[PDB]
């Protein structure tokens, strides 16, 4: 049962290497999403800062401003959720690396037999 | 109209060296962007070194019952891990200040 | 340097003929084009050594 | 009296023209616009008449 046990561990290890490659690609995609949402915050808040330099009666409580406040709040919730997703993906990659090291050790000790 | 001559020379000088200050400010903003890019590259390189050292130590520590040995390289690896931790934290503090 | 020199040069112009003519918009395009060109040259220089 | 009302409309016209320039430059501001930067606390800071 050494031979087919070793083959089972070998199949598990090969597919585990595949799945870890996909999880690393997922990590980089979450990073790209984070940096683009940061640039969108930059654009919205620069527009809101420049807008309030108006003359005296032109300071107006417009629906544009009552929408820009919800703009900044919604992009804040977006970047918060994507940061949470980054932490969770790092945690799952940690668990995958643990399983990889465990089955590497078991592959070696069964291959000695 | 000499009062107007006074006022226009005065405001024109204000314009001119406002323009000078603006040019210097833009050039320093350029170099600030280049420095924070250098900081980010340094942080990811130090993260790679931490990966290498801690992978080496956890690959080493699976040794059999007789060869569980406290060599010099184990102590060196532990010191290296906490040294690169201190390095990484200092780089994030400099990033936030910049 | 020559584009910024011409942009600062065209601010000596007397107040009737201080103009936003065909020259001004093309000089603005020149400045942005030159900066885009040399930033992209810096990025492909970064690609080469890697 | 006619001169007074004409000057009132002229100062209001100056206010509208400057606000038009501000809202135009805000309207054409896209991403990759080469004029953006971070701003902190602007989501709370307002003067409003």
């Amino acid at each position: 049962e050494t031979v087919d046990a070793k083959n089972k561990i070998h199949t598990h290890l090969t597919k585990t290497l595949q799945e870890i490659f996909q999880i690393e690609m997922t990590i980089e995609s979450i990073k790209k999403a984070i940096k683009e949402k940061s640039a969108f915050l930059k654009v919205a808040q620069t527009r809101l800062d420049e807008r309030t330099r108006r003359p005296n009666v032109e300071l107006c409580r417009d629906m544009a401003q009552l929408r820009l406040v919800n703009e900044v709040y919604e992009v804040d919730e977006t970047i918060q959720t994507l940061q949470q997703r980054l932490r969770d993906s790092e945690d799952t990659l940690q668990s995958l690396a643990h399983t990889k090291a465990t089955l590497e050790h078991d592959l070696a000790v069964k291959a000695n037999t | 109209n000499l009062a107007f001559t006074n006022r226009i020379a005065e405001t024109v000088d204000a314009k001119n060296k406002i323009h000078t200050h603006l040019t210097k400010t833009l050039q320093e903003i350029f170099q600030i962007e280049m420095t924070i890019e250098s900081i980010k590259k340094a942080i990811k390189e130090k993260s790679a070194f931490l990966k290498v050292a801690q992978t080496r130590l956890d690959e080493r520590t699976r040794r059999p019952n007789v060869e569980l040995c406290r060599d010099m390289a184990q102590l060196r690896l532990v010191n290296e891990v906490y040294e690169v931790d201190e390095t990484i934290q200092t780089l994030q503090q400099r990033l936030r200040d910049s | 340097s020559i584009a910024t020199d011409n942009l600062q040069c065209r601010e000596r112009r007397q107040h009737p003929d201080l103009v936003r003519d065909y020259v001004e918009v093309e000089l603005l395009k020149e400045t942005e084009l030159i900066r885009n060109i040399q930033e992209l040259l810096k990025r492909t220089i970064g690609q080469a050594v890697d | 009296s006619d001169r007074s009302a004409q000057h009132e409309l002229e100062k209001d016209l100056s206010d509208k023209q400057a606000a038009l320039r501000i809202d135009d430059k805000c309207q054409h501001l896209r991403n990759t616009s080469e004029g953006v930067s971070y701003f902190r606390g602007v989501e709370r800071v307002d003067a409003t008449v």
Binding site: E36, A39 | L22, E33 | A3, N36, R43 | T32
Partner: peptide, 17 residues
């Protein structure tokens, strides 16, 4: 490629005319 991540802060400035 397209410089979609880096934004410098300046242009060739003239105000209003």
């Amino acid at each position: 490629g397209a410089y979609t991540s880096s934004g410098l802060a300046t242009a060739g400035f003239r105000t209003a005319k």
